């Protein structure tokens, strides 16, 4: 069966964004019973107003749909027009920016979960144009969690490893290793995600992941981070910008291939990116959408695949993010249109016959690498009907 | 017996600082056999150059001195001066500014544990100027926590329970109960730290200090934070800037009681303080030194004292730190000649016939805080001469 995730299918729509409403950084979860609400913020490009609707699909732990109707998960109706928005304003780019919060007046949870927001054209609504994922926690246990690059397999060399304990004295549960599903993401992303994990011990009030072979993960580097807050001076990692109608073009910098060397510690976001222009007061209506273009020289890798990565294209590795190779530059380059803001990513390969991209080849993988890992325990015993999300926690190093 | 504490015993030392050199942010440990080393930082006034030594004094776990010689500890002297130093440039009040990195190329530890650095006039080596303290690490155990404001006598109220277990499968302990000695310091003070741990439970290759009634803080509240980096204007809560010869005088805007209302996030810096001034290249030898006033307004607290608290005075709780109270004017008062910088600062209470200093009165205690919270794990088997330092980790929410 189908997955649901975070991702577009339209070229009209851009800058997908799916965080805590109010928050800088954050993750794509909220509590149940809470007050804080999850943000879908994106951009449908042209002058037209356009009417867009969404329905709300609960998922198990997998992001597979749930067997659950609409009435056993949600207050409120399918089809919800989407109504908070504004036009851009003094950019070469026409756009309008359209903001949704969930929960609101026309739609509450009643469960816990994983939900996925499809989103539509009210003229069109079997054409879904992104998909929107967030999840829902009632918080009944906590989870002790540390990152060491001394693992299992090596020392503080080139891998991160994940422990936890899941700590249910107030909710016990008394097969886990059967009514527990865990998942651990590295950065955001789902391509290397872990998850049919077994305790290594049960308590009565205790469940401990520790020294689990599959919660080794490759340490990676710190993202690449350019910036583009101005068509009038070159920003961070920016080489120049021109103009040929209709937009600006910025050429970023070379980027090389970082495997071979010795950790330099940057301060990067993992892979997030944030709407910010020059004087602006409101990014989300005045920030331009330019070209912006990618270069990294190296030799083409073989036997796979390499792959744009980071929230710029919602961690997802197709099509879209794929990079071709050209032969007479000797670069795989790529020309993508951004709104202006400071932007992280990096470049991961993915071996022939894999879904799994490596940050290895062209990142290279540094134990000391600061990374967050978060850790979905979804909670389901026999004859319940769905995944419940009993906890959640994100811990860096 | 007696305890060495990160403490400053003469009026012409000021701005003592123990961070790790190099950092922004860090917590007073580094690794034995690391490339990583602490930094000894401070001011001693007057236009003098003044011939500075220091002693090495190694520590068991609760900060008495061991009975480890110096030859068993260090290789180097005892009594070696402090070389690196620089005069301060355009400030009204005259200093020298002084570091002392550790290790270095006279001294280097050969083991693990607790120091404190005894520092003196090489003219009376009996009178210690100051003591800055510590730890080193020699770090054979991964240490799994978290902090949560759901807790065992409350819900997400007014308190914060730190969980946390000790992995040690490559260091395995026969029995713990009895040859660990744990400490737990929240926002690095020592007046309401916490040691006589007991496992709840102890497996091979994990010991859980999970469900610990004493691992349960009261919340707090984020820090007050003020700023002056310049005579010109008035900075973050300052009111106005005045001079009477020889000094400035700041007088920060007027604090109350914050325990009677609702969490207000703001960004602090759990106590710490940073030298810096508007357009200094080098703030530790240019940056000035201005009588700060503090008030309080608030009716007295009885039975007991109000103590301002922060790195400030290195979060000791003593007669200089200790607060008058103004009965002319109905407010808790205090005078104290600072470098120029950001700073965070509170008002404990302690109760009388205590040692222990409460945010609840004065700052209040609401769950949601950012606090951070080190776990130092100190081993010592039977016949061992030391308590050694075998983990340690800082952990936030
Ligand atoms: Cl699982
Ligand atoms: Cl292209
Ligand atoms: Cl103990
Ligand atoms: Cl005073
Ligand atoms: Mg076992
Ligand atoms: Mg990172
Ligand atoms: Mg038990
Ligand atoms: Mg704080």
Not at 207 to 230: K, Q
Not at 385 to 390: G, V
Request: hydrophobic residues 30%; aromatic residues 14%.
């Amino acid at each position: 069966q189908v997955k649901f995730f975070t991702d577009v299918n339209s070229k009209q729509i851009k800058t997908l964004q799916v965080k805590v409403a109010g928050e800088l950084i954050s993750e794509p979860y909220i509590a149940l019973g809470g007050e804080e609400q999850i943000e879908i913020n994106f951009d449908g490009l042209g002058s037209g107003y356009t009417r867009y609707a969404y329905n709300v699909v609960h998922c198990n732990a997998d992001w597979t749909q749930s067997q659950l109707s609409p009435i056993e998960y949600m207050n409120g109706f399918q089809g919800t027009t989407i109504d908070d928005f504004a036009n851009s304003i003094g950019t070469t780019t026409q756009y309008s920016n359209y903001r949704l919060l969930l929960p609101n007046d026309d739609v509450q949870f009643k469960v816990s979960g994983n939900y996925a927001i499809q989103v539509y054209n009210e003229d069109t609504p079997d054409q879904i144009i992104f998909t929107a994922c967030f999840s829902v926690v009632e918080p009944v246990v906590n989870i002790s969690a540390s990152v060491s690059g001394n693992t299992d397999i090596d020392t503080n060399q080139s891998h991160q490893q994940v422990s936890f304990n899941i700590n249910n004295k107030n909710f016990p549960i008394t097969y886990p290793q059967t009514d527990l599903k865990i998942f651990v993401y590295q950065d955001n992303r789902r391509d290397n995600a872990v998850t049919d994990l077994q305790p290594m011990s049960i308590l009565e009030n205790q469940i401990s992941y520790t020294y689990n072979r599959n919660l080794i993960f490759p340490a990676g580097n710190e993202y690449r981070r350019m910036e583009f807050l101005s068509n009038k001076y070159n920003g961070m990692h920016v080489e120049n910008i021109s103009f040929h109608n209709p937009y600006y073009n910025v050429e970023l910098m070379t980027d090389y291939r970082r495997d071979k060397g010795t950790y330099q510690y940057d301060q990067d976001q993992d892979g997030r990116f944030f709407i910010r222009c020059s004087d602006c007061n409101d990014p989300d209506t005045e920030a331009d959408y330019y070209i912006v273009h990618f270069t990294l020289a190296c030799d083409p890798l073989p036997d796979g695949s390499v792959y744009l990565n980071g929230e710029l294209f919602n961690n997802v590795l197709d099509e879209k993010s794929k990079m071709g190779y050209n032969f007479e530059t000797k670069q795989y380059e790529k020309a993508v249109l951004l709104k202006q803001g400071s932007y992280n990513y990096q470049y991961l390969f993915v071996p022939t016959g894999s879904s799994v991209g490596q940050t290895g080849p062209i990142e290279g993988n540094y134990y000391q690498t600061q990374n967050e890992y978060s850790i979905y325990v979804y909670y389901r015993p026999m004859g319940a009907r769905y995944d419940r999300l009993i906890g959640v926690t994100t811990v860096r190093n």
